Structures are given as structure tokens and as C-alpha cells.
């Protein structure tokens, strides 16, 4: 505890956003949580009164992890409020919701105001996710669960990595395993490396290219388990840019050592990102330069 903690009176909840894992996430304003900013619009993660514990510790610790992180492409944590009423945490507001939800919305099936992404807007999207992964791995971190559902999208369309439920250190489990996003080795030996995160990135890229469709439709997790351990692979989406699919296949090399690194992935596309990347991105930063 200590330090990150901030006054409960400095956080006022405006309206509700949506039910979250632990509790209904809200949107509000925080007093003095950002330099040069009197007030800041934020997202309030709360927990239900139900789990008076045996989880409230789990909650605050997932946020404790975020403390270590500080990147443009990784949702920023702007304070926690442990000791007190509803144990909550406040962080950088991502008005547009998770990438999976945002992508689902672009599909015509649910008629609009935004057209599907463009091969360009997809690279920018891939590259942003990758920068954040590149940074996470750089600080000796593994996500273990990288998927569209755990990426947030900001009003200005910036995509960042905003969920660290399974994110542990390179060094029970109430809930299903992200079978469909898991590498072969992860599925086989319970192994998790930066390399597996990459394998998952690939799946994320597939999600983008199919607008967050279900990976391996028809197959059950078990079947996926098998299928993938035998070298199985998802097909090339309909109308997928040759470029994008190539990047997928690269992330799915069976051999964990043959797959590219996040830094490597960024470099293969840096020439196609949007100008402003060169500044804000961790990649071109001096903390890796
Ligand atoms: C109704 O469903 C939802 C709609 C949402 C959000 N969440 C929902 O469900 C949880 C968020 C959102 C969640 C969140 C978090 Cl956890 C941390 C930081 N920023 C965040 N923004 C924005 N919209 C529009």
C-alpha cells in the first residue's frame, strides 16, 4: 500500500460504463492525479460488496502490477483506493472500450459511422499493441493472456494494452484458459514466455482482420488444444492484406525460438506506421534506443 493511494473524496463517479470482472466499472473525475491537470476524466474499477475478500486482495494486486508500467501504449494507472469503502482503482479513461468490442461494432451485421479499418489503420493498430508488448517484455514481463478483449481503444483511436489479469513476472485459477489464444507450448507444458505472447499477438491480428470473430469456429477448446499442438493454424481471413497475413504466419512458427520479437515486429512495420509514432512510441524512445 501507500503512495499510489489517493483520497476517496477526490474521485467522483459520473455514470456507469459496464460490468467488469470484479465489479461495475464507472467513469468519473479525479482530483489531482495528473501533472498540470486540476481534474482528469478517468475510469473507476470497483469490486462488488460480495467478495469482501479472497478477491479484494487479488484486485488491488493486479493494479499493483500496473504500478511498474508507464508507457504510452499501456493503459496508465492513476491511483488506487484500498483502505476504505468500495475498494477501487482509477486509471486512464479509454472511452471507446476494449478492442474486441470496438471491432465487433464496426461489422455491418449490426448497422454505422465508422468503416472497417484500412490496411494502414490496421498496421497502426498492430504496431501500437506491439509497442506496448515490446515494453512489457523489456521490463521482464509476460502477459499470458493477450487478446482483443484485453486491449483498450482511446477516443482518438489509440489502442493500448489495458488488462493484466494473468500478466505475471517471467520469474488456483478460477476461470477458463484462453485456449484459442494460447501457443502450442503454453497448451502443452504450461509454458509462458515473451514468445508465447507473440503467438497470441498473431491471433489478435487475426481478430482485427476478421473484426474480432471467434478463432477456430467449429472446434471446441479441446479440439483447438489438439489441432494447434499438431501445427494447426487459422486460415487467411476473407480479403486479408497479404501483408497482415504474412505477419500472422510469422508469429505462429511452431518453434518458439523462430518467432519474431515484438521489437522485431515493430521494425518490420515501422516504415508504415503513422508519423507521430516516432515520438510517443517506446520503440523510438531513449529507454531502448
Ligand atoms: C458496457 O460495457 C463497457 C463499455 C465501456 C467500457 N467498459 C465496459 O464494460 C466493462 C469502457 C472502459 C472500461 C475501462 C477499464 Cl476496465 C479501464 C480503463 N478504461 C476503460 N474504459 C468504456 N466503454 C464505452
Residue 152: which residues within 8 A CB-CB, separation 6 or more?
75, 94, 96, 97, 98, 99, 159, 160, 161, 162, 163
Strand partners, 71: 74
Residue 167 main-chain phi, psi, to 5 deg: -50, 105
Q: Which of 161, 201, 208, 152 is nearest to 181 (CA)?
A: 201
Q: What is the resolution of this structure in A?
A: 3.0
- Known catalytic membership, residue 145: yes
The domain 94-286 having CATH identifier 3.30.70.1450: the answer here is no
Q: Which of 48, 115, 50 is nearest to 87 (CA)?
A: 48
Asked whether residue 217 is marked as a ligand-binding residue, the answer is no
Ligand 1 atom 6: residue of nearest CA: 97
The pairing of beta strand 141-142 with beta strand 25-34: unpaired
Question: Are 43 and 17 a contacting pair, CB within 8 Å?
Answer: yes
Rounded Cα distance, 190 and 95, in Å: 35
Q: Which of 208, 203, 211 is nearest to 249 (CA)?
A: 203
Half-sphere exposure of 189 (CA within 13 A, CB side): 6
Torsion (CA) 186, 262, 68, 87 in degrees, nearest 10: -60
| Helix 99-106 and helix 194-210, axial crossing angle in degrees, nearest 10 | 20
Which CATH number is associated with domain 1-93?
3.30.200.20
SS (H, E, C) the chain: CCCCECCHHHEEEEEEEECCCCCCEEEEEEEEEECCEEEEEEEEECCCCCCCCCCHHHHHHHHHHHHHCCECCECCEEEEECCCCCCEEEEECCCCCEHHHHHHHHCHHHCCCCCCCCHHHHHHHHHHHHHHHHHHHHCCEECCCCCHHHEEECCCCCEEECCCCCCEECCCCCCCCCHHHCCHHHHHHCCCCHHHHHHHHHHHHHHHHHCCCCCCCCCCHHHHHHHHHCCCCCCCCCCCCHHHHHHHHHHCCCCCCCCCCHHHHHHHHHHHCCCCHHHHCCCCCCCCC
Site to probe by mutation for ligand 1, drawn from 11, 78, 98, 149 as the one with most ligand atoms within 8 Å of Cβ, is 98
Structure determined by: X-ray
Site to probe by mutation for ligand 1, drawn from 13, 15, 18 as the one with most ligand atoms within 8 Å of Cβ, is 18
What are the extents of the domains in the chain?
1-93, 94-286
Strand partners, 159: 153
CA distances 58 to 27, 53, 68, 136, Å, are 22, 9, 17, 20
CA distances 268 to 130, 133, 135, 193, 231, Å, are 11, 15, 17, 21, 24
- Is any ligand 1 atom within 6 A of the Cβ of residue 88? no
Q: Which of 150, 123, 124 is nearest to 136 (CA)?
A: 150
The reply to whether 94-286 shares the fold of 1-93 is no
Amino acid at each position: 500500500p501507500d503512495e499510489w493511494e489517493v483520497a476517496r473524496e477526490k474521485i467522483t463517479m459520473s455514470r456507469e460504463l459496464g460490468q467488469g470482472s470484479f465489479g461495475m466499472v464507472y467513469e468519473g473525475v479525479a482530483k489531482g492525479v495528473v501533472k498540470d491537470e486540476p481534474e482528469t476524466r478517468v475510469a473507476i474499477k470497483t469490486v462488488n460488496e460480495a467478495a469482501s475478500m479472497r478477491e479484494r486482495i487479488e484486485f488491488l494486486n493486479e493494479a499493483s502490477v500496473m504500478k511498474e508500467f508507464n508507457c504510452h501504449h499501456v493503459v496508465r494507472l492513476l491511483g488506487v483506493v484500498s483502505q476504505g469503502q468500495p475498494t477501487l482503482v482509477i486509471m486512464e479513461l479509454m472511452t471507446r472500450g476494449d478492442l474486441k468490442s470496438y471491432l465487433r461494432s464496426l461489422r455491418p451485421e449490426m448497422e454505422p459511422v465508422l468503416a472497417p479499418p484500412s490496411l494502414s489503420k490496421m498496421i497502426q493498430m498492430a504496431g501500437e499493441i506491439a509497442d506496448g508488448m515490446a515494453y512489457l517484455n523489456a521490463n521482464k514481463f509476460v502477459h499470458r493472456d493477450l487478446a482483443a478483449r484485453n486491449c483498450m481503444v482511446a477516443e482518438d483511436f489509440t489502442v493500448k494494452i489495458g488488462d493484466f489479469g494473468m500478466t505475471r513476472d517471467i520469474y488456483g485459477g478460477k476461470g477458463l484458459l484462453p485456449v484459442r489464444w494460447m501457443s502450442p507450448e503454453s497448451l502443452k507444458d504450461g509454458v509462458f514466455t515473451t514468445y508465447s505472447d507473440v503467438w497470441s499477438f498473431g491471433v489478435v491480428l487475426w481478430e482485427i482482420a476478421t473484426l474480432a470473430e471467434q478463432p477456430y469456429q467449429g472446434l471446441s477448446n479441446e479440439q483447438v488444444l489438439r489441432f494447434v499442438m499438431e501445427g494447426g493454424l487459422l486460415d487467411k481471413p476473407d480479403n486479408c492484406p497479404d501483408m497482415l497475413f504474412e505477419l500472422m504466419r510469422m508469429c505462429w512458427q511452431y518453434n518458439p525460438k523462430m518467432r519474431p520479437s515484438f521489437l522485431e515486429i515493430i521494425s518490420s512495420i515501422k516504415e508504415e506506421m503513422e508519423p507521430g509514432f516516432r515520438e510517443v512510441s517506446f520503440y523510438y524512445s531513449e529507454e531502448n534506443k
